[PDB]
Amino acid sequence: SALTQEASVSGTVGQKVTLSCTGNTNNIGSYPVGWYQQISHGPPKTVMFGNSLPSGIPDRFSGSKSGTTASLTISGLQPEDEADYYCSTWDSSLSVQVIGGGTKVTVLGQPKAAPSVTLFPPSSEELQANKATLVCLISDFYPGAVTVAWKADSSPVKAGVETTTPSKQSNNKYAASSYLSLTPEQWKSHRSYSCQVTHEGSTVEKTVAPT
Amino acid sequence: SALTQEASVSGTVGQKVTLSCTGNTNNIGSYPVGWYQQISHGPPKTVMFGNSLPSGIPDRFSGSKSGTTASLTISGLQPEDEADYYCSTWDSSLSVQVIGGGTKVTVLGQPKAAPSVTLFPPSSEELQANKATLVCLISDFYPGAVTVAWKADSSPVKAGVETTTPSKQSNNKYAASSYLSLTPEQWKSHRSYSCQVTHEGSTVEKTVAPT
Ligand SMILES: [Br-]
């Protein structure tokens, strides 16, 4: 996505909370930014546009912009704000409206939990079949929204990544998976591979290497 | 909602489907309508603005509008067209972007595919940390509904099992993962552990062993 939003932004009731939306000079750096809110699967509604507060929305919501990063601040987080928030703007470089991935804003009803990250190399059984897959297990995190990035050696992998939608497990925390399909030629040629998981203020990165 | 959309619409592969967006004179009747596609609660993409086709969106998407009702027509439904579609415009009585409730498009008759199962033994990084985790990667299956059962040697295992709800990946197929938490001594005390995946009455099972 041309616009980058954080995965999860949470806090207790009455807490000052801030979302961000990062792009480039051809979208956020020169065009107004709108923020839309969607609860469950209900109808989305505009809650901020061009740093201007729409009629009917409370003034706890405030929008600002500095360079290529727009922000939505919620001064006094309340339970009725628990929703997904999407930012969007016009992208003159592509001549189309452009929308970010969305941020899940959660009112904490349970302790915030950073995720456990376990990186699995390709088993010898799979490589004996001329196949290679790496799995990055993301477990026991709340709220259920994370950002995953992969690195070949120390350079990012810009293709081949598949990350599952977080799902709630039996302990009421969330779990997800991110797998990367390779060939035996790449797994041996590279010195290491990395999976990086971002959950609010916590970022965990695991690294594995061929035997 | 100020904009009215049908809740859900279905159609087989190759059918022509038309979604409608109903509004007012101060919003739909006066201003261009944009259509936005959201998948797997992923980043949404605009598929039609002002009845004109953006770049990269195939020709099968066409837009029309007459009076206070705008329409998006999708000829030749494909698996990747299956999504939620939202329409939005500018309202003039109010001064806001307004969004409809969305239309869930379900593409029928998509090809079936058995899941590819990959069972990962506990990594060396976590065995040295006195941990043990088996991960059963399930991918490339349609439809998106599996049932996972584990085995220690030949005995069923339930305690320590968590399975992710399937989610659609970039190939329009589903992916999930089930993980079993063990201690390092359970892991070597047994001959093997197994992960059985059942999809559409047919079973795929994998088996791993220590070191
Ligand atoms: Br702005």
Q: Please give the interface size between A and B, counted as residue pairs whose CB atoms are below 8 Å apart.
A: 121
User: How many structural domains comprise chain A?
Assistant: 2
Q: How far is B45 from chain A (nearest CA, A)?
A: 7
CA of A65 from ligand 1 middle (Å) equals 6
In this structure, the answer to whether residues A84 and A115 fall within a common structural domain is no
What is the DSSP track for B60-96? Answer: TEEEEEETTEEEEEE-S--GGG-EEEEEEEE-SSS-S
Residues B124, B122: Cα–Cα separation, whole Å = 7
CA of A60 from ligand 1 middle (Å) equals 18
In this structure, the answer to whether residues B127 and B81 fall within a common structural domain is no
Q: Is the Cβ of A39 closer than 8 Å to some Cβ of chain B?
A: no
Locate B90 and state its tokens.
């500018």
What is the DSSP track for chain B? Answer: --SB--SEEEEETT--EEEEEE--TTTTTTS--EEEEE-TT---EEEEETTBPPTTS-TTEEEEEETTEEEEEE-S--GGG-EEEEEEEE-SSS-SEEE---EEEEEESPPPBPPEEEEEPPPHHHHHTT-EEEEEEEEEEBSS--EEEEEETTEEE-TTEEEPPPEE-TTS-EEEEEEEEE-HHHHHHSS-EEEEEEETTEEEEEEE---
Residues B23, B144: Cα–Cα separation, whole Å = 36
In this structure, the answer to whether residues A103 and A114 fall within a common structural domain is no
The residue in chain A having the minimum alpha-carbon distance to the alpha carbon of residue B35 is A97
Q: What residues are neighbours of ligand 1 (ion), with CB under 5 Å? A: A 32-33, 50, 65
Q: How many CB atoms lie within 10 A of CB B95?
A: 12
Please check whether residue A77 is in contact with residue A25, taking contact to mean a CB–CB distance below 8 angstroms.
Answer: no
In this structure, the answer to whether residues A182 and A158 fall within a common structural domain is yes
In this structure, the answer to whether residues B144 and B77 fall within a common structural domain is no
In this structure, the answer to whether residues B126 and B105 fall within a common structural domain is no
In this structure, the answer to whether residues B85 and B13 fall within a common structural domain is yes
In this structure, the answer to whether residues A29 and A86 fall within a common structural domain is yes
In this structure, the answer to whether residues B170 and B189 fall within a common structural domain is yes
- Residue finishing a domain among A109, A135, A150: A109
Of the residues B84, B137, B182, B208, the best mutation for testing chain A's interface (the one with the most A CB atoms within 10 Å of its CB) is B137
In this structure, the answer to whether residues B58 and B123 fall within a common structural domain is no
Residues B96-129: b if buried by 16+ CB within 10 A, e if exposed: bbbbbbbbbbebeebeebebbbbbbbbbebbbee
State how far Cα A145 lies from the chain centre: 7
Residues of chain A found within 8 Å of residue B136, distances taken between Cβ atoms = none
User: What value, to the nearest 5°, has the Cα angle with vertex A86 and ends A199 and A160?
Assistant: 60
Domain span holding position A39: 1-109
- Residue finishing a domain among B109, B134, B157: B109
Q: Do B179 and A176 touch (CB under 8 A)?
A: no
CA of A46 from ligand 1 middle (Å) equals 14
- Residue finishing a domain among B109, B135, B169: B109
Final resolution, Å = 2.5
Consecutive H or E run containing A55:
none
CATH number at residue A26: 2.60.40.10
In this structure, the answer to whether residues B8 and B88 fall within a common structural domain is yes
